[PDB]
Protein backbone atom coordinates (compact mmCIF):
# COMPACT_ATOMS: atom_id res chain seq x y z
CA UNK A 1 0.00 0.00 0.00
CA UNK A 2 2.82 2.42 0.80
CA UNK A 3 4.49 1.67 -2.53
CA UNK A 4 1.18 2.19 -4.35
CA UNK A 5 0.64 5.48 -2.51
CA UNK A 6 4.09 6.74 -3.48
CA UNK A 7 3.65 5.67 -7.10
CA UNK A 8 0.30 7.49 -7.18
CA UNK A 9 1.92 10.57 -5.66
CA UNK A 10 4.49 10.49 -8.47
CA UNK A 11 1.86 11.75 -10.90
CA UNK A 12 -0.79 13.42 -8.75
CA UNK A 13 -2.02 16.69 -10.27
CA UNK A 14 -2.18 19.02 -7.29
CA UNK A 15 -4.56 21.98 -7.35
CA UNK A 16 -1.89 24.70 -7.51
CA UNK A 17 0.33 22.87 -10.01
CA UNK A 18 2.95 21.83 -7.43
CA UNK A 19 3.94 18.18 -7.15
CA UNK A 20 3.21 16.35 -3.90
CA UNK A 21 6.04 13.85 -4.25
CA UNK A 22 7.88 13.07 -1.03
CA UNK A 23 -4.55 44.74 -6.95
CA UNK A 24 -3.52 47.94 -8.75
CA UNK A 25 -4.29 50.25 -5.85
CA UNK A 26 -5.19 53.88 -6.45
CA UNK A 27 -2.27 55.85 -7.85
CA UNK A 28 -0.50 58.59 -5.88
CA UNK A 29 -0.33 62.25 -6.85
CA UNK A 30 3.31 63.41 -7.20
CA UNK A 31 2.28 66.46 -5.18
CA UNK A 32 1.62 64.10 -2.26
CA UNK A 33 5.15 62.73 -2.64
CA UNK A 34 7.69 64.99 -0.92
CA UNK A 35 11.14 65.33 -2.47
CA UNK A 36 14.36 65.51 -0.46
CA UNK A 37 15.97 68.76 -1.59
CA UNK A 38 19.37 70.38 -1.13
CA UNK A 39 19.24 74.02 -0.08
CA UNK A 40 21.44 76.34 -2.16
CA UNK A 41 21.82 79.97 -1.09
CA UNK A 42 22.65 81.22 -4.59
CA UNK A 43 20.65 82.59 -7.52
CA UNK A 44 19.34 79.92 -9.85
CA UNK A 45 21.69 79.08 -12.76
CA UNK B 1 -26.71 19.44 -5.02
CA UNK B 2 -29.13 16.74 -6.18
CA UNK B 3 -31.97 19.27 -6.57
CA UNK B 4 -30.48 22.75 -7.12
CA UNK B 5 -27.42 21.59 -9.07
CA UNK B 6 -23.76 21.56 -8.16
CA UNK B 7 -23.09 25.22 -8.96
CA UNK B 8 -25.91 26.59 -6.80
CA UNK B 9 -24.95 24.29 -3.95
CA UNK B 10 -21.24 25.11 -4.11
CA UNK B 11 -21.81 28.87 -4.21
CA UNK B 12 -24.30 28.72 -1.33
CA UNK B 13 -21.97 26.59 0.79
CA UNK B 14 -19.06 28.96 0.15
CA UNK B 15 -21.22 31.93 1.17
CA UNK B 16 -22.26 30.11 4.34
CA UNK B 17 -18.66 29.16 5.13
CA UNK B 18 -17.47 32.75 4.72
CA UNK B 19 -20.30 34.10 6.88
CA UNK B 20 -19.68 31.47 9.56
CA UNK B 21 -15.98 32.32 9.67
CA UNK B 22 -16.97 35.98 9.95
CA UNK B 23 -19.30 35.22 12.86
CA UNK B 24 -16.55 33.25 14.60
CA UNK B 25 -14.25 36.28 14.47
CA UNK B 26 -16.84 38.68 15.90
CA UNK B 27 -15.40 38.23 19.39
CA UNK B 28 -11.93 39.43 18.36
CA UNK B 29 -13.32 42.13 16.08
CA UNK B 30 -15.63 43.55 18.75
CA UNK B 31 -12.63 44.28 20.99
CA UNK B 32 -9.75 44.95 18.60
CA UNK B 33 -11.21 45.31 15.11
CA UNK B 34 -9.95 43.62 11.96
CA UNK B 35 -6.47 45.09 12.40
CA UNK B 36 -5.29 42.20 14.60
CA UNK B 37 -6.53 39.52 12.20
CA UNK B 38 -4.16 37.80 9.80
CA UNK B 39 -4.11 38.66 6.11
CA UNK B 40 -6.30 35.67 5.28
CA UNK B 41 -8.77 36.59 8.01
CA UNK B 42 -8.75 40.26 6.96
CA UNK B 43 -9.52 39.29 3.37
CA UNK B 44 -12.28 36.94 4.48
CA UNK B 45 -13.76 39.62 6.74
CA UNK B 46 -13.91 42.15 3.92
CA UNK B 47 -15.44 39.53 1.63
CA UNK B 48 -17.99 38.57 4.29
CA UNK B 49 -19.02 42.16 4.94
CA UNK B 50 -19.56 42.69 1.23
CA UNK B 51 -21.51 39.41 1.01
CA UNK B 52 -23.76 40.30 3.94
CA UNK B 53 -24.48 43.69 2.39
CA UNK B 54 -25.23 42.05 -0.95
CA UNK B 55 -27.71 39.59 0.54
CA UNK B 56 -29.88 42.63 1.27
CA UNK B 57 -32.25 43.76 -1.45
CA UNK B 58 -34.59 46.66 -2.18
CA UNK B 59 -37.85 44.75 -1.79
CA UNK B 60 -41.00 45.43 -3.78
CA UNK B 61 -43.06 45.90 -0.61
CA UNK B 62 -40.39 48.21 0.82
CA UNK B 63 -41.25 50.99 -1.64
CA UNK B 64 -43.92 52.30 0.74
CA UNK B 65 -41.18 52.87 3.35
CA UNK B 66 -38.12 54.04 1.43
CA UNK B 67 -39.79 55.26 -1.75
CA UNK B 68 -37.43 53.18 -3.91
CA UNK B 69 -38.90 50.61 -6.34
CA UNK B 70 -38.04 47.00 -5.68
CA UNK B 71 -36.01 44.68 -7.87
CA UNK B 72 -36.08 41.07 -9.03
CA UNK B 73 -32.88 39.06 -9.51
CA UNK B 74 -32.86 35.91 -11.69
CA UNK B 75 -31.53 32.82 -9.95
CA UNK B 76 -28.68 32.35 -12.43
CA UNK B 77 -27.61 35.97 -11.97
CA UNK B 78 -27.71 35.56 -8.19
CA UNK B 79 -25.56 32.42 -8.33
CA UNK B 80 -23.05 34.05 -10.68
CA UNK B 81 -22.84 37.28 -8.68
CA UNK B 82 -22.28 35.50 -5.38
CA UNK B 83 -19.74 33.22 -7.05
CA UNK B 84 -17.80 36.31 -8.09
CA UNK B 85 -18.18 37.79 -4.60
CA UNK B 86 -16.75 34.65 -3.00
CA UNK B 87 -13.88 34.50 -5.48
CA UNK B 88 -13.07 38.13 -4.72
CA UNK B 89 -13.85 39.91 -7.98
CA UNK B 90 -15.54 42.80 -6.13
CA UNK B 91 -13.10 43.16 -3.23
CA UNK B 92 -12.17 46.67 -4.40
CA UNK B 93 -15.62 48.28 -4.44
CA UNK B 94 -16.86 50.03 -1.29
CA UNK B 95 -19.14 48.11 1.03
CA UNK B 96 -22.03 50.54 0.57
CA UNK B 97 -22.08 49.69 -3.14
CA UNK B 98 -23.59 46.31 -2.19
CA UNK B 99 -26.38 47.71 0.01
CA UNK B 100 -30.01 47.37 -1.11
CA UNK B 101 -29.60 46.60 -4.81
CA UNK B 102 -30.58 43.88 -7.25
CA UNK B 103 -28.19 42.16 -9.64
CA UNK B 104 -24.76 43.04 -10.95
CA UNK B 105 -25.99 45.89 -13.16
CA UNK B 106 -27.24 47.72 -10.07
CA UNK B 107 -23.96 46.94 -8.32
CA UNK B 108 -22.00 48.50 -11.18
CA UNK B 109 -24.24 51.57 -11.27
CA UNK B 110 -24.04 52.12 -7.51
CA UNK B 111 -20.27 51.61 -7.54
CA UNK B 112 -20.02 54.24 -10.27
CA UNK B 113 -22.15 56.61 -8.20
CA UNK B 114 -19.83 55.98 -5.24
CA UNK B 115 -16.73 56.55 -7.38
CA UNK B 116 -15.58 52.95 -7.89
CA UNK B 117 -15.56 50.89 -11.08
CA UNK B 118 -16.94 47.46 -11.93
Amino acid sequence: LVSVINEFKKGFQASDGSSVVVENAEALDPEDLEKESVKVRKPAP
Amino acid sequence: PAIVGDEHYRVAQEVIRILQRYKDLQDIIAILGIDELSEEDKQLVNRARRIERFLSQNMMAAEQFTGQPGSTVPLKETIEAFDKLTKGEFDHLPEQAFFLIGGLDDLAKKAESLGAKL
Partner: protein, 245 residues
Protein backbone atom coordinates in the same frame (compact mmCIF):
# COMPACT_ATOMS: atom_id res chain seq x y z
CA UNK C 1 -25.21 26.70 31.43
CA UNK C 2 -25.93 30.07 29.83
CA UNK C 3 -25.33 31.91 33.10
CA UNK C 4 -22.04 30.12 33.75
CA UNK C 5 -20.86 30.95 30.24
CA UNK C 6 -21.83 34.59 30.75
CA UNK C 7 -19.90 34.74 34.02
CA UNK C 8 -16.84 33.26 32.34
CA UNK C 9 -17.11 35.75 29.49
CA UNK C 10 -17.41 38.61 31.98
CA UNK C 11 -14.22 37.45 33.70
CA UNK C 12 -12.45 37.18 30.35
CA UNK C 13 -13.57 40.66 29.31
CA UNK C 14 -12.47 42.13 32.64
CA UNK C 15 -9.00 40.64 32.27
CA UNK C 16 -8.82 41.94 28.69
CA UNK C 17 -9.84 45.40 29.91
CA UNK C 18 -7.12 45.45 32.56
CA UNK C 19 -4.45 44.40 30.07
CA UNK C 20 -5.55 46.93 27.45
CA UNK C 21 -5.60 49.77 29.99
CA UNK C 22 -2.10 48.86 31.15
CA UNK C 23 -1.00 48.85 27.51
CA UNK C 24 -2.56 52.27 26.92
CA UNK C 25 -0.70 53.83 29.84
CA UNK C 26 2.57 52.16 28.81
CA UNK C 27 2.03 53.55 25.31
CA UNK C 28 1.53 57.04 26.74
CA UNK C 29 4.91 56.82 28.47
CA UNK C 30 6.44 55.39 25.29
CA UNK C 31 5.08 58.33 23.28
CA UNK C 32 6.72 60.71 25.73
CA UNK C 33 10.03 58.89 25.32
CA UNK C 34 9.82 58.82 21.51
CA UNK C 35 9.09 62.54 21.33
CA UNK C 36 12.05 63.19 23.61
CA UNK C 37 14.29 61.14 21.32
CA UNK C 38 13.08 62.97 18.20
CA UNK C 39 13.74 66.35 19.80
CA UNK C 40 17.17 65.13 20.88
CA UNK C 41 17.97 64.12 17.30
CA UNK C 42 16.76 67.38 15.71
CA UNK C 43 19.87 69.56 16.33
CA UNK C 44 22.23 67.22 14.47
CA UNK C 45 19.83 67.20 11.53
CA UNK C 46 19.77 70.99 11.46
CA UNK C 47 23.56 71.27 11.64
CA UNK C 48 24.29 68.67 8.96
CA UNK C 49 21.65 70.19 6.68
CA UNK C 50 23.32 73.58 7.09
CA UNK C 51 26.74 72.11 6.30
CA UNK C 52 25.38 70.36 3.21
CA UNK C 53 23.81 73.64 2.08
CA UNK C 54 27.16 75.39 2.48
CA UNK C 55 29.09 72.68 0.63
CA UNK C 56 26.57 72.67 -2.22
CA UNK C 57 26.81 76.45 -2.53
CA UNK C 58 30.56 76.06 -3.20
CA UNK C 59 30.76 72.78 -5.10
CA UNK C 60 29.82 71.13 -8.40
CA UNK C 61 26.43 69.46 -7.92
CA UNK C 62 27.31 66.63 -10.29
CA UNK C 63 27.37 63.80 -7.76
CA UNK C 64 26.00 60.54 -9.21
CA UNK C 65 23.76 60.45 -6.12
CA UNK C 66 22.33 63.84 -7.12
CA UNK C 67 21.31 63.72 -10.82
CA UNK C 68 18.16 62.24 -12.35
CA UNK C 69 19.00 59.13 -14.33
CA UNK C 70 17.91 58.61 -17.91
CA UNK C 71 15.31 56.01 -18.91
CA UNK C 72 14.84 55.09 -15.23
CA UNK C 73 13.47 51.60 -14.68
CA UNK C 74 13.61 50.71 -10.97
CA UNK C 75 12.80 52.35 -7.64
CA UNK C 76 13.79 51.33 -4.13
CA UNK C 77 10.90 51.66 -1.68
CA UNK C 78 11.65 51.37 2.04
CA UNK C 79 8.41 50.51 3.82
CA UNK C 80 8.68 51.15 7.56
CA UNK C 81 6.23 49.18 9.71
CA UNK C 82 6.07 48.05 13.31
CA UNK C 83 7.08 44.75 14.89
CA UNK C 84 4.32 44.49 17.49
CA UNK C 85 0.71 44.42 16.37
CA UNK C 86 -1.53 46.22 18.86
CA UNK C 87 -1.34 49.46 16.88
CA UNK C 88 -4.74 50.09 15.36
CA UNK C 89 -4.30 51.11 11.72
CA UNK C 90 -0.62 52.06 11.76
CA UNK C 91 0.65 49.23 9.57
CA UNK C 92 -2.54 49.21 7.49
CA UNK C 93 -2.17 52.90 6.66
CA UNK C 94 1.55 52.52 5.96
CA UNK C 95 0.88 49.65 3.57
CA UNK C 96 -1.96 51.46 1.80
CA UNK C 97 0.40 54.39 1.23
CA UNK C 98 3.05 51.96 -0.03
CA UNK C 99 0.53 50.44 -2.45
CA UNK C 100 -0.35 53.91 -3.71
CA UNK C 101 3.35 54.58 -4.25
CA UNK C 102 3.67 51.30 -6.14
CA UNK C 103 0.78 52.28 -8.40
CA UNK C 104 2.37 55.68 -9.03
CA UNK C 105 5.67 54.01 -9.92
CA UNK C 106 3.88 51.60 -12.26
CA UNK C 107 2.21 54.51 -14.05
CA UNK C 108 5.73 55.93 -14.59
CA UNK C 109 7.19 52.66 -15.87
CA UNK C 110 9.12 51.71 -12.75
CA UNK C 111 9.26 48.31 -11.08
CA UNK C 112 9.25 48.74 -7.28
CA UNK C 113 12.19 47.09 -5.53
CA UNK C 114 10.88 46.54 -2.03
CA UNK C 115 12.75 46.98 1.24
CA UNK C 116 10.82 46.47 4.47
CA UNK C 117 11.31 47.42 8.12
CA UNK C 118 9.25 45.61 10.73
CA UNK C 119 7.59 42.21 10.70
CA UNK C 120 4.02 43.33 10.02
CA UNK C 121 4.87 44.59 6.54
CA UNK C 122 6.78 41.35 5.99
CA UNK C 123 3.64 39.35 6.69
CA UNK C 124 1.55 41.64 4.50
CA UNK C 125 3.89 41.30 1.52
CA UNK C 126 4.39 37.56 2.01
CA UNK C 127 0.62 37.15 1.79
CA UNK C 128 0.71 39.17 -1.45
CA UNK C 129 3.51 37.09 -3.02
CA UNK C 130 5.75 40.15 -3.41
CA UNK C 131 9.50 39.69 -3.19
CA UNK C 132 11.22 41.54 -0.35
CA UNK C 133 14.87 42.19 -1.18
CA UNK C 134 15.94 42.82 2.41
CA UNK C 135 14.18 43.30 5.73
CA UNK C 136 15.22 44.67 9.11
CA UNK C 137 13.21 43.89 12.24
CA UNK C 138 13.34 43.98 16.02
CA UNK C 139 14.24 47.66 16.53
CA UNK C 140 11.10 49.43 15.29
CA UNK C 141 10.16 50.22 18.90
CA UNK C 142 13.45 52.05 19.56
CA UNK C 143 15.64 52.42 16.47
CA UNK C 144 19.20 53.66 16.89
CA UNK C 145 21.59 55.32 14.47
CA UNK C 146 23.28 51.97 13.80
CA UNK C 147 20.15 50.55 12.16
CA UNK C 148 19.58 53.73 10.16
CA UNK C 149 23.21 53.65 9.05
CA UNK C 150 22.91 50.04 7.89
CA UNK C 151 19.65 50.70 6.03
CA UNK C 152 21.08 53.80 4.35
CA UNK C 153 24.25 51.94 3.39
CA UNK C 154 22.24 49.15 1.78
CA UNK C 155 19.89 51.52 -0.04
CA UNK C 156 22.64 53.80 -1.35
CA UNK C 157 24.75 50.82 -2.40
CA UNK C 158 21.83 49.46 -4.43
CA UNK C 159 21.10 52.88 -5.91
CA UNK C 160 24.68 53.48 -7.04
CA UNK C 161 24.94 49.91 -8.34
CA UNK C 162 21.93 50.80 -10.49
CA UNK C 163 24.05 53.38 -12.32
CA UNK C 164 25.70 50.95 -14.74
CA UNK C 165 22.56 48.81 -15.10
CA UNK C 166 21.19 48.90 -18.64
CA UNK C 167 17.77 47.49 -19.40
CA UNK C 168 17.42 44.27 -17.44
CA UNK C 169 21.22 43.91 -17.41
CA UNK C 170 23.19 44.78 -14.28
CA UNK C 171 25.89 46.72 -16.13
CA UNK C 172 29.58 46.50 -15.38
CA UNK C 173 28.72 46.24 -11.67
CA UNK C 174 26.96 42.90 -12.04
CA UNK C 175 24.35 44.02 -9.48
CA UNK C 176 20.92 45.16 -10.63
CA UNK C 177 20.25 48.26 -8.52
CA UNK C 178 17.56 50.94 -8.56
CA UNK C 179 17.14 54.37 -10.11
CA UNK C 180 15.36 55.90 -7.10
CA UNK C 181 15.02 55.51 -3.34
CA UNK C 182 11.71 55.98 -1.54
CA UNK C 183 10.81 55.77 2.14
CA UNK C 184 7.21 55.19 3.22
CA UNK C 185 6.76 55.97 6.90
CA UNK C 186 4.33 57.46 9.40
CA UNK C 187 5.00 61.11 10.18
CA UNK C 188 3.97 62.18 13.69
CA UNK C 189 2.49 65.66 13.33
CA UNK C 190 0.40 65.58 16.53
CA UNK C 191 -1.06 63.25 19.14
CA UNK C 192 -3.87 62.66 16.63
CA UNK C 193 -2.16 63.59 13.33
CA UNK C 194 -0.15 60.54 12.30
CA UNK C 195 0.02 60.33 8.52
CA UNK C 196 1.59 57.74 6.26
CA UNK C 197 3.79 59.57 3.75
CA UNK C 198 6.02 58.54 0.87
CA UNK C 199 9.24 60.50 0.36
CA UNK C 200 11.85 60.29 -2.39
CA UNK C 201 15.23 60.31 -0.64
CA UNK C 202 17.39 59.69 -3.72
CA UNK C 203 18.07 61.31 -6.10
CA UNK C 204 17.96 64.62 -4.23
CA UNK C 205 16.51 67.65 -5.97
CA UNK C 206 18.37 70.96 -5.69
CA UNK C 207 16.63 73.93 -4.07
CA UNK C 208 17.65 77.57 -4.48
CA UNK C 209 31.79 85.33 4.40
CA UNK C 210 33.41 82.51 2.44
CA UNK C 211 33.86 79.23 4.29
CA UNK C 212 37.25 77.51 4.21
CA UNK C 213 36.63 73.96 2.99
CA UNK C 214 39.41 71.41 3.40
CA UNK C 215 40.69 69.31 1.71
CA UNK C 216 38.30 70.46 -1.02
CA UNK C 217 34.56 71.12 -1.32
CA UNK C 218 33.95 68.07 -3.51
CA UNK C 219 35.41 65.48 -1.13
CA UNK C 220 33.53 67.00 1.80
CA UNK C 221 30.30 66.98 -0.21
CA UNK C 222 30.81 63.34 -1.20
CA UNK C 223 31.46 62.33 2.40
CA UNK C 224 28.52 64.38 3.70
CA UNK C 225 25.87 63.12 1.28
CA UNK C 226 25.74 59.49 2.53
CA UNK C 227 25.68 60.73 6.11
CA UNK C 228 22.85 63.10 5.20
CA UNK C 229 20.88 60.17 3.77
CA UNK C 230 21.58 58.11 6.89
CA UNK C 231 20.46 61.03 9.06
CA UNK C 232 17.20 61.35 7.14
CA UNK C 233 16.62 57.59 7.45
CA UNK C 234 17.24 57.82 11.19
CA UNK C 235 14.82 60.74 11.50
CA UNK C 236 12.20 58.76 9.59
CA UNK C 237 12.74 55.79 11.90
CA UNK C 238 12.37 57.92 15.02
CA UNK C 239 9.23 59.61 13.75
CA UNK C 240 7.74 56.28 12.68
CA UNK C 241 8.43 54.86 16.15
CA UNK C 242 6.67 57.84 17.72
CA UNK C 243 3.73 57.36 15.36
CA UNK C 244 3.59 53.67 16.26
CA UNK C 245 3.47 54.50 19.97
Amino acid sequence: ATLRELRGRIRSAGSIKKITKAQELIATSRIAKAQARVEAARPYAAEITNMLTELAGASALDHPLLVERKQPKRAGVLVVSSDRGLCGAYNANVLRRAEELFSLLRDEGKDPVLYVVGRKALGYFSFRQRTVVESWTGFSERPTYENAREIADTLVNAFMAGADDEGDDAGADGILGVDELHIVFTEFRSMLSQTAVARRAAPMEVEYTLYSFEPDPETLFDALLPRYIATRVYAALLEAAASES
